[PDB]
């Protein structure tokens, strides 16, 4: 299944860029980094669980957020770019 | 149509932050800013055409990008968050 991962982290500090790079390393194991902080991940339900668990320890939960959008099959036919 | 807008701009520059302010100002007329550079927009097909033209005039197409994800009905029940 496809999960779109959008990570909101402030990249104006070294710590924030460090977390973005850690998140990117994790997410790119399961998909494509289509934008600096947006990942298209192809994951089984158990891979998705594992990913969330790992993402929890990396982010600063007070200042960052991650959103996960469960996109349908044929989601590729429903993305446009400007 | 529910359209997720994701804007990649370099906020380390004041020009990039300015563009993001103008992107957000536009997008929040059509939806909700859910993260710094992510917008959940509910638009008609005509509004979507207009919004794209407007965004094209704001972003720097050499350095920035925008992606639009057309989400299905009840997408609200298929978004999970951390942080």
Automatic annotation (TrEMBL), chain A:
One of its GO terms (molecular function) is RNA endonuclease activity. Its EC number is 3.1.-.-. Belongs to the CRISPR-associated endoribonuclease Cas2 protein family. Keywords: Antiviral defense, Endonuclease, Hydrolase, Magnesium, Metal-binding, Nuclease. This is CRISPR-associated endoribonuclease Cas2. Mg(2+) binds at residue 8. Transmembrane segments: none annotated. The chain holds residues 1 to 82 of 97 of the full protein. Its cofactor is Mg(2+). CRISPR (clustered regularly interspaced short palindromic repeat), is an adaptive immune system that provides protection against mobile genetic elements (viruses, transposable elements and conjugative plasmids). CRISPR clusters contain sequences complementary to antecedent mobile elements and target invading nucleic acids. CRISPR clusters are transcribed and processed into CRISPR RNA (crRNA). Functions as a ssRNA-specific endoribonuclease. Involved in the integration of spacer DNA into the CRISPR cassette. One of its GO terms (biological process) is maintenance of CRISPR repeat elements. The keyword Nuclease applies. The keyword Nuclease applies. Coiled coil: none annotated. It comes from the Bacteria. Homodimer, forms a heterotetramer with a Cas1 homodimer.
């Amino acid at each position: 299944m496809m999960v779109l991962v959008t990570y909101d982290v402030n990249t104006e500090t070294p710590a924030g860029r460090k977390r973005l790079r850690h998140v990117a390393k994790l997410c790119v194991d399961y998909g494509q980094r289509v934008q600096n902080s947006v990942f298209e991940c192809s994951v089984t339900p158990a891979e998705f669980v594992d990913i969330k668990h790992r993402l929890t320890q990396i982010i600063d939960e007070k200042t960052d957020s991650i959103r996960f959008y469960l996109l349908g099959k044929n989601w590729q036919r429903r993305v446009e770019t400007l």
